[PDB]
Nucleic acid binder design. Structure first.
Lengths: 123, 129, 150, 80, 80, 205
RNA sequence: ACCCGCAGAAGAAGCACCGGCUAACUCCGUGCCAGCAGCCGCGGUAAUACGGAGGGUGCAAGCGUUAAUCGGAAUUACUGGGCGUAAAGCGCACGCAGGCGGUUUGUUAAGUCAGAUGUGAAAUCCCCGGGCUCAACCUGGGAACUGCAUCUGAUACUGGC
RNA sequence: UAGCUAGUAGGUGGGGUAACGGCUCACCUAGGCGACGAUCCCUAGCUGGUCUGAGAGGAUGACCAGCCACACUGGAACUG
């Protein structure tokens, strides 16, 4: 550029990939879950993947991702929703937390028990 | 036009070396001559002459040792908008000491070696190797 | 007297049918650990041939490094396309300083008291051409009857 | 030493005081070069020797009036 | 106006106290212009007990600084 | 906890006894000595070659009884006060109180020498020391506390002092259970199985 | 505090990871399905990648996960970027305010630099040392805040005249 | 979002404050301000400082020191 430029203005910079406005700047929110659907994934693989429609207890409505040895969800029973990157399906931003509210853990685990939910003690 | 003395003097010399010229000519001034008066002291030139009275021209003869080249870098680095000003220790050690810096001081145009010996600082005009 | 080293190996990309080609590329270096270096690139079928074409190129060239106080005689620029390399001297009793891939070339030249910046492509087969453009741009005077230094 | 400035008269439409414009240098926000900046202020005068285009010398005093702290010292150069 | 007083020399629950010269107004944190020894209220049979600095006090003896109740026995705990 | 499980595994990974569980003649003990672990072998990939320095760091960590977080701090101290970092670090871990109690023959192994420090049996310059990280310097005097000098595991460690290389930089006498650290180790005067030209090339992460 | 007893090894070890980068791996179940990952990718009967299982790798009283903000991005180029084409030169010319302008001798000392005074606390990163078992906390001076004001100077260069 | 404007702009009296000044009650004239973004609208505690780094800045405002306002709210006054 020419040596007199960049007067009375700073440089513009880029935003750090913020994408989850229904969370109100919080790490998580509650949602009731209303419908479940199936979506065709990208790149050639013998696979199909699932999504759920979620109304949030803060007046929003979005589509969220589901997995962890399949799904356990049911209408209006209440679950948690947070940000999670995919990749796994196109056009999606949100993820479902396991071992919390109506959402189950993973049945019978011997390692990695601090991830994706594990059964409660007794007996 | 003669709008800038340094964007003339250094450019004529740097391009004159790419032409393998023994000597190069320019419109003369007491600033261009004060720089030649340092280049001769540090051994870069073997001669310079000023001729023309009321339209004076400066012609300086580069001191070659064997075949080609006499300057391994000849840059201004400073700008007319904001010039490079340095305090009495802040004088640059050009090409890690294989070159020199030329300084404008209240005691005239001199080397960073001579400015440091005089306890002076000022404005940098040339960075030379 | 003599130091030898392997820097890089890569298979040729080409899908040729059907399958891929069996050609490989290699990059090796030779030096003395005292002030000299040479380099070689080679292309042939499978690594045990490609590495030998690279060694036989590296064993056919040798350039001197200009040294003073055990470090570079001056800071120097050397360029090949996207590899815009600048090499500069370091402090007394030093070696890290050098790391990454530049360590592999300075290890056969013998001088880890040298700092580098690539200002673009660090691609090993191309940056090695820019460093030796810098070694051809090293000054050895041949000027001490008029100019200061040494 | 006294606290003084010089500047040009730019409006003489008031009952006693005058309006004067002074110039100063300020640094470019990244390239550090000095560039020129105007300051336009009211100046205290009770003698009425000058009008627009004239250049005057001014001194900084005690506060003289609401937002006025500078007084006219002398005329330095007349327009034409 | 300065008085000879104490200042806290860190160490949790373990009082060593630095002896300092300061004006006896406003907050007691800092405000001291010179250090003149250590009160050392926790030393017992050690060759490094209660200490003075006979040069740093030399402007402040006699009338030079005020003496406070806190240090009125310092001259008999030091050697001497 | 302090290592846990069998220590002799480290001596099988070399094919040479690594001075582990040593007693009396330190030979045989029907422990599978000089035999390789496992059965698949054999026939193994020949490193990255970057892994060669990570394995060389492993040897020094297992021998001198230190973890990565502390090894990085010893490298930072060794990269100072002249000489190369590889030689300086290999002499800096030699200056540990737990290693000096082992070189003075009061422990047959570094695990039982480190036990004397962890159980506060060790004295340095008339002060009792409970830290194994304690730095031993030129002319420092190290001894066993007077009512612990007669404990028999220290007397059983003297059986190795007549078999090992006498450390040229320190001097000791079991008739008083007292020794002195004379000088800082030099690589011309102490030879090791550690590759000193590899442990300099670290970090690199 | 600091030291000394009674009880009996008495109450005290996990967390992530095991296809590749990435050290650790093999044996069954499934058979392009179902499940898995940071990215590349895995899966049709020999799956080290899914479930199951023994051991192993790395960290350890912690180990993994994550949110925001920086950083690699010399991928907003002050340090340190471009505009024939891949992304950018106004349709074009004129011009008020701004930016920029030959040369020498006087003169001024604003800008620049020099000799000093005053200050930038506690700290920063760093060099050397101290009060307490180490350390915090507290230090006690260096290195330093390269600016801002005043005093006393220099006049080449830039600007004023 | 490009215009804003009768303490707005200069002047004359007498008050007020510890003190300069419209701070204040009353006159006499028609000026003054805006691209360094005035006006209009939204939103808000913050500097020395921190993390990263050759250096600098977007964001942040703990420490260790400073610093604007509030005590339901909208506001006022005395004592000092």
């Amino acid at each position: 550029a020419t040596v007199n430029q960049l007067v009375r203005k700073p440089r513009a910079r880029k935003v750090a990939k913020s994408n989850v406005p229904a969370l109100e700047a919080c790490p998580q929110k509650r949602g009731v879950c209303t419908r479940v659907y199936t979506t065709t994934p990208k790149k050639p693989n013998s696979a199909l993947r699932k999504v759920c429609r979620v109304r949030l207890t803060n007046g929003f409505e979005v589509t969220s991702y589901i997995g962890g040895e399949g799904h356990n969800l049911q209408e209006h029973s209440v679950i948690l929703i947070r940000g999670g990157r995919v990749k796994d399906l196109p056009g999606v931003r949100y993820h479902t937390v396991r071992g919390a509210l109506d959402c189950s853990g993973v049945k019978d685990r011997k390692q990695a028990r601090s991830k994706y939910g594990v059964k409660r003690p007794k007996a | 036009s003669m709008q800038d003395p340094i964007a003339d003097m250094l450019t004529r010399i740097r391009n004159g070396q790419a032409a393998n010229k023994a000597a190069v000519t320019m419109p003369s001034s007491k600033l261009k001559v004060a720089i030649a008066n340092v280049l001769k002291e540090e051994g870069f030139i073997e001669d310079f002459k000023v001729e023309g009275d009321t339209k004076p021209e400066l012609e300086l003869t580069l001191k070659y040792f064997q075949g080609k080249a006499v300057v391994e870098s000849i840059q201004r680095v400073s700008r007319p908008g904001l010039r490079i000003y340095k305090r009495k220790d802040e004088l640059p050690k050009v090409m890690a000491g294989l070159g020199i810096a030329v300084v404008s001081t209240s005691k005239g145009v001199m080397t960073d070696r001579a400015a440091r010996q005089a306890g002076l600082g000022g404005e940098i005009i040339c960075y030379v190797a | 007297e003599l130091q030898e080293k392997l820097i890089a190996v890569n298979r040729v990309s080409k899908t040729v049918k059907g399958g891929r080609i069996f050609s490989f590329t290699a990059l090796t270096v030779v030096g003395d650990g005292n002030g000299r270096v040479g380099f070689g690139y080679g292309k042939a079928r499978e690594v045990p041939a490609a590495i030998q074409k690279a060694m036989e190129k590296a064993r056919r060239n040798m350039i001197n490094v200009a040294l003073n106080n055990g470090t570079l005689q001056h800071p120097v620029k050397g360029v090949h396309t996207g590899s815009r390399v600048f090499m500069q001297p370091a402090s007394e009793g030093t070696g890290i300083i050098a790391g990454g891939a530049m360590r592999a070339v300075l290890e056969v030249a013998g001088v880890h008291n040298v700092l580098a910046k690539a200002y673009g492509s660090t691609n090993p087969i191309n940056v090695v051409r820019a460093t030796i453009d810098g070694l051809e741009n090293m000054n050895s005077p041949e000027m001490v009857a008029a100019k200061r230094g040494k | 030493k006294i606290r003084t400035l010089q500047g040009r008269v730019v409006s003489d439409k008031m009952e006693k005081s005058i309006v004067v414009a002074i110039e100063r240098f300020v640094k470019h926000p990244i390239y550090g070069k000095f560039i020129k900046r105007t300051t336009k202020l009211h100046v205290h005068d009770e003698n009425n020797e000058c009008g627009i285009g004239d250049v005057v010398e001014i001194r900084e005093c005690r506060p003289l009036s609401k937002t006025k702290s500078w007084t006219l010292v002398r005329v330095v150069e007349k327009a034409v | 106006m300065v008085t000879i007083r104490l200042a806290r020399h860190g160490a949790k629950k373990r009082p060593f106290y630095q002896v300092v010269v300061a004006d006896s107004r406003n907050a007691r944190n800092g405000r001291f212009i010179e250090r003149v020894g250590f009160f050392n209220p926790i030393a017992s049979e050690k060759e490094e007990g209660t200490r003075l600095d006979l040069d740093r006090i030399a402007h402040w003896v006699g009338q030079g600084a005020t003496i406070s109740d806190r240090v009125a026995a310092l001259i008999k705990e030091v050697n001497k | 906890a302090r290592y846990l499980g069998p220590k002799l595994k480290l001596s099988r990974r070399e094919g040479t006894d690594l001075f582990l569980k040593s007693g009396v003649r330190a030979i045989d003990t029907k422990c599978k000595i000089e035999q390789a672990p496992g059965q698949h072998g054999a026939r193994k990939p020949r490193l990255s070659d970057y892994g060669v320095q990570l394995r060389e760091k492993q040897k020094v960590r297992r021998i001198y009884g230190v973890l990565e977080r502390q090894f990085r701090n010893y490298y930072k101290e060794a990269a100072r006060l002249k000489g190369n970092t590889g030689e300086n670090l290999l002499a800096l871990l030699e200056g540990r109180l737990d290693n000096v109690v082992y070189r003075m023959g009061f422990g047959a192994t570094r695990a039982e020498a480190r036990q004397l420090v962890s159980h506060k049996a060790i004295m340095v310059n008339g002060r009792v020391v409970n830290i194994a990280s304690y730095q031993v310097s030129p002319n420092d005097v190290v001894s066993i506390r007077e009512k612990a000098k007669k404990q028999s595991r220290v007397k059983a460690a003297l059986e190795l002092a007549e078999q090992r290389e006498k450390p040229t930089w320190l001097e000791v006498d079991a008739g008083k259970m007292e020794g002195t650290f004379k000088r800082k180790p030099e690589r011309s005067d102490l030879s090791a199985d550690i590759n000193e030209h590899l442990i300099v090339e670290l970090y690199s992460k």
